[PDB]
Design a protein around this ligand. Structure first.
Ligand SMILES: Nc1ncnc2c1ncn2[C@@H]1O[C@H](COP(=O)(O)OP(=O)(O)O)[C@@H](O)[C@H]1O
Ligand SMILES: Nc1ncnc2c1ncn2[C@@H]1O[C@H](COP(=O)(O)OP(=O)(O)O)[C@@H](O)[C@H]1O
Ligand SMILES: Nc1ncnc2c1ncn2[C@@H]1O[C@H](COP(=O)(O)OP(=O)(O)O)[C@@H](O)[C@H]1O
Ligand SMILES: Nc1ncnc2c1ncn2[C@@H]1O[C@H](COP(=O)(O)OP(=O)(O)O)[C@@H](O)[C@H]1O
Lengths: 574, 313, 200
């Protein structure tokens, strides 16, 4: 004991004072590791498992089982020590110090004979005093572990077991694998019930049943880069911390952990407040502030996100998948931009990927990265990492007709189950994303023509995967009048930045509407008209010093009756 | 040690195994041939009489889209393991390129990515008794088929690292969409597979299964079995859902289409019931501790019902 | 303190003389990191952010909050020290100097109990000296950060985060990602108004 303390920590002595977290639900794993420990020769188990499933919790559970006395005769009164190999290698100016320390430790634990040794983060044995092919700790432990007179347990992860232990088969020969499974949701529920007391005592708060029930539910459902029960434990700890900060007895409920998950992963899974409730019920008009017309698409997306916000959206399908079909210029990209502005306040939060560059079969690797052994493996995919930065985001696929069928084949899984495996081999979540696909195809009759063109140019399973098919209709005269309204509004908004005020009369706006109506309209025409007949004249006049700052400019019309074509009409800038 | 269930057949698991056709039919409506074949395969596996070299089960699924080809495999994984996440899902849709075959078994030495090894090989090594699903097998190139050409006969695969993984206790399932009254389309699917797949590969699959088209009794059962998900989701917020018989009849009436699968039923329920429930919840029409009774108004139950509406309590 | 000055710099002592620029408009990030520092187990956040946003500026703002004393009781009278990993690994000429120095530093932190670490360029923690017979600092600090008796903060670019930190899931486990987003236009204006005095 006088030597082990210098290089290790007594876990049994920690269990004397109860500093260890109580462990529940791992009785099968404890029985398995004790079953390995009761062997005659080569009795050394290894705790193989995913990082964050309680591999360490297994060994403190074993220590608690020992100190309570549940153990059979073979494991009674066994002091359990974790070993710091860093403490062994430190302070050794010569090799003799290092393996002299190691041989003294093994001699002591052999002489006393009542010490079970634990190696945390096991891979460090391959190379301790020197390299793998020279004298190190593992080479010294080979005769002791092979003949099985020493009881050692260890913990390592699957990737590490593959990157450190498995390449040297001698190490894996002396260790029996014992998998520590990731606990189920109800298993994590009992774990949270067990560890309620320590966090309530530390954070000086109170936690309700619905709190950690909802915590386990959202933890398993939403976060896809961490593993249970670790993330729920983290949430409970930080939530008690947040209440302890806010107080300077509080209660911890589901809205708090909901706000935390919004802070952490950006998912707006919140208890709906009244203001955002009235915003969500009336967001159709808010969208109609920017995108005008196309009521069907706006209503459909409003219903889809109302489903998403109310917690009625299916977990294994994404938030919403849509095909935006219609003639060019109607505002298919404008709708996605408006949803981006509504959801995030900015237009740069919309991740936009163009399908024109995916015009060749060899461009399919851009989205999910490169296969192993080729260039581009280290940075990985393009869209996958963009989704990883923001789980709650809307992705846009501009000009979907330019893409070829292999892209849709690679995306069918995203449409259906909402997962995506990158070139690195990791699954990327899509259960909180919104799928937007813009199509310019087929140009009442337009509905059938667009549907026929889509089923001709797409495979049946792809059109089966998509949720709603929307055919954008051609705009009307009132709609292009409101286009003129938005155009002059943004022009005046730009002009106010230079101490200038802009206004137009009704006749000029009517003339703009008359010069901007055709089936090839949208916004790409009638913006050429503005830039040619209004913006051009304004810039021309302001460069040679008329209508400068401090003067309000009014746009009128001359030589027009207000009803005719207005070809002889000339815009006047007062 | 390794999770392989070579055990003594206790009475409970035996009674489960004899009746597991019903257990799969709890989630999978129709497709009795595929369920029966899966039952025979798992019975042959668990009875101890199996070819040691060959895997436990190898099948190819073909038919219309959305006929439960993936859902049967997911239900089988839930049956064997207790959850749907344990199914090894390797999606072949991102393997259109010839050079992407290294994603399955790993990178060769001397190149980047050699250390982490393969993806499916590691997952097989972790869980030797698991089902491995290859979705959209027609959509990847035939070059990638050659790595699996060994395991569909020998059940052994060599990674880039050099070690050999075993497929003797793994169930292999492939899903395609070739071809898309029963026997004509079955022969069409057979001819499509014969022309598209090399005959040397096809002989290594234990059984070929053609999925039958969904019928009216299947979709009227389907409405209940799938609205059970919505009811269970509502129970998380203390909401209770009940559907009238007219509600089921109208839901099946507006979603019946033989040229597509069951995703039209999802579209119908999503556009008719779930959106209205979301609107009423966020408008606080229904609150906690209240039940919801959905009934069909302005319908007789026999007509097509272009004017029938849903009433919510 | 007699050992830590040779390997680190006291940002609290820098906050004594006001050698750090004032930080404007980072209240949400500073309150989130202060929340993570208030945890019992795994209280170690990482400031993931684009390079040039002010990940180090968040730490300087934490030091300014400490000297101005608006932090809650769990951060009263605690020195914020940055950690220079290079100075730890620089003078060894051997195998055991690095581990001995790291263990001495951790013993000093444990026996003081009022020190919070900051590690610039976090990804150098893994492989912080990897010789034939050397054990890296990352595996040494894994048990210390797992239970939570060691409190540290880090700043890391998302790209290098994905290159190195993600590749080791164990270090990813002990760390809580805190996203430091790009400042807005008015945020940039407010920061410029704050820095105007020192720049004039
Ligand atoms: N059954 C349980 N009871 C109490 N705490 C648990 C349980 N399972 C996991 N934990 C907590 O989750 C964490 C899991 O850590 P672990 O993954 O064992 O570390 P390592 O990866 O280094 O072995 C532990 O800190 C422990 O507190
Ligand atoms: N109804 C509208 N309201 C507001 N802006 C519009 C409208 N229609 C088009 N626009 C503008 O014109 C652009 C055309 O977008 P879109 O119609 O999607 O192009 P395409 O049809 O080629 O995909 C949009 O980016 C938007 O800014
Ligand atoms: N027999 C069935 N039982 C339950 N659900 C089914 C059944 N057949 C189809 N489905 C539905 O079909 C969808 C899955 O279709 P899938 O088999 O994946 O099509 P594909 O094999 O063409 O990809 C699921 O959403 C499921 O609801
Ligand atoms: N709120 C702020 N107030 C004042 N300066 C800031 C603020 N935010 C960022 N900065 C500036 O950002 C710089 C810090 O960037 P830093 O985090 O060191 O980038 P990197 O991590 O890539 O080295 C400092 O020079 C600081 O002036």
């Amino acid at each position: 004991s006088l030597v082990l303390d210098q290089f290790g920590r007594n876990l049994t002595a920690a269990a004397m004072e109860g500093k260890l977290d109580p462990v529940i639900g791992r009785e099968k794993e404890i029985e398995r590791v004790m079953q390995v420990l009761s062997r005659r020769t080569k009795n050394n188990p290894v705790l193989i498992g995913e990082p964050g499933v309680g591999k360490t919790a297994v060994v403190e559970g074993l220590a608690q089982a020992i100190v309570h006395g549940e153990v059979p005769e073979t494991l009674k009164d066994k002091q359990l020590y974790t070993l710091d190999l860093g403490s062994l290698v430190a302070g050794s100016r010569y090799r003799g110090d290092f393996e002299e320390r190691l041989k003294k430790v093994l001699k002591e634990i052999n002489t006393r004979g009542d010490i079970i040794l634990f190696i945390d983060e096991l891979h460090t044995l391959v190379g301790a005093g020197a390299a793998e092919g020279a004298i190190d700790a593992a080479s010294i432990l080979k005769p002791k572990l092979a003949r099985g007179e020493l009881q050692t347990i260890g913990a390592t992860t699957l990737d590490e077991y593959r990157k450190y232990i498995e390449k040297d088969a001698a190490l894996e020969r002396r260790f029996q694998p014992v998998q520590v499974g990731e606990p189920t949701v109800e298993h994590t529920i009992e774990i949270l019930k067990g560890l309620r007391d320590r966090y309530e005592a530390h954070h000086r708060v109170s936690i309700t049943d619905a709190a950690m029930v909802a915590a386990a539910t959202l933890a398993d459902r939403y976060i896809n880069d961490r593993f249970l029960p670790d993330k729920a434990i983290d949430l409970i700890d930080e939530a008690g911390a947040r209440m302890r900060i806010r107080r300077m007895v509080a209660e911890v409920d589901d809205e708090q952990i909901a706000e935390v998950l919004g802070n952490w992963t950006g998912i707006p899974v919140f208890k709906l407040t009244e203001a955002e409730t009235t915003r969500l019920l009336r967001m159709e008009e808010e969208l109609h502030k920017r995108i005008i017309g196309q009521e069907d698409a706006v209503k459909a997306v409003s219903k889809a996100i109302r489903r998403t916000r109310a917690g009625l959206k299916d977990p294994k399908r994404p938030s919403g998948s849509f095909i935006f079909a219609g003639p060019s210029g109607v505002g298919k990209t404008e709708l996605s931009k408006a949803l981006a502005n509504f959801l995030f306040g900015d237009d740069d939060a919309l991740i936009q990927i163009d399908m024109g560059e995916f015009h060749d079969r060899f461009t399919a690797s851009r989205l999910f990265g490169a296969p192993p052994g080729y260039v581009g493996y280290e940075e990985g995919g393009q869209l996958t990492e963009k989704v990883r930065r923001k789980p709650f985001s809307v992705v846009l696929f501009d000009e979907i007709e330019k893409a070829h069928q292999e892209i849709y084949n690679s995306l069918l899984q995203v449409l259906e189950d909402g997962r995506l495996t990158d070139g690195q081999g990791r699954t990327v979540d899509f259960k909180n994303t919104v799928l937007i696909f813009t199509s310019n195809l087929g140009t009442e009759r337009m509905k059938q023509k667009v549907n026929d063109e889509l089923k001709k140019h797409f495979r049946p399973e792809f059109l089966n995967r998509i949720d709603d098919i929307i055919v954008f209709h051609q705009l009307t005269r009132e709609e292009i009048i409101r286009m003129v309204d938005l155009m002059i509004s943004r022009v005046a908004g730009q002009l106010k930045s230079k101490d200038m005020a802009l206004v137009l009369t009704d006749a000029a706006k009517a003339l703009l509407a008359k010069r901007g109506f055709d089936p090839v309209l949208g916004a790409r025409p009638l913006r050429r008209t503005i830039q040619r007949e209004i913006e051009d004249q304004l810039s021309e006049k302001i460069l040679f010093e008329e209508v400068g700052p401090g003067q309000v400019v009014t746009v009128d019309v001359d030589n027009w009756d207000g009803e005719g074509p207005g070809e002889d009409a000339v815009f006047t800038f007062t | 040690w390794t999770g392989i269930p070579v055990f003594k057949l206790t009475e409970a698991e035996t009674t489960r195994l004899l009746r597991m056709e019903e257990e799969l039919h709890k989630r999978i409506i129709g497709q009795e041939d595929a369920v029966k074949a899966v039952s025979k395969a798992i019975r042959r596996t668990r009875a101890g009489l199996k070819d040691p070299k060959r895997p436990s089960g190898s099948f190819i699924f073909a038919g219309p889209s959305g006929v439960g080809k993936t859902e049967l495999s997911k239900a089988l994984a839930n049956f064997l393991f207790g959850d749907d996440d344990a199914l090894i899902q390797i999606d072949m849709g991102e393997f259109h390129d010839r050079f992407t075959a290294s994603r399955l078994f790993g990178a060769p030495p001397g190149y980047v990515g050699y250390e982490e090894g393969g993806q499916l090989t590691e997952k097989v090594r972790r869980k030797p008794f698991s089902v491995v699903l290859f979705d959209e097998i027609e959509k990847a190139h035939q070059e990638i088929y050659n790595s699996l050409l060994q395991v569909l006969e020998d059940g052994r695969l060599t990674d880039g690292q050099g070690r050999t993984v075993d497929f003797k206790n793994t169930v292999l399932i492939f899903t395609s969409n070739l071809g898309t009254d029963y026997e004509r389309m079955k022969q069409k699917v057979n001819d499509e597979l014969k022309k598209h797949f090399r005959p040397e590969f096809l002989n290594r699959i234990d059984d070929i299964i053609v999925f039958h088209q969904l019928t009216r009794e299947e979709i009227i059962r389907m409405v209940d079995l799938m609205i059970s998900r919505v009811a269970g989701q509502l129970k998380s917020k203390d909401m209770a859902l009940v559907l009238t018989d007219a509600a089921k009849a109208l839901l099946a009436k507006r979603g019946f289409d033989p040229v597509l699968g069951a995703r039209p039923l999802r579209r119908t329920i999503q556009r008719e019931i779930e959106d209205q429930l979301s609107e009423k919840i966020l408008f606080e029409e229904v609150g906690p501790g209240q039940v919801v009774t959905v009934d069909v108004d302005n319908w007789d139950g026999e007509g097509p019902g272009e004017d029938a509406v849903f009433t919510f309590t």
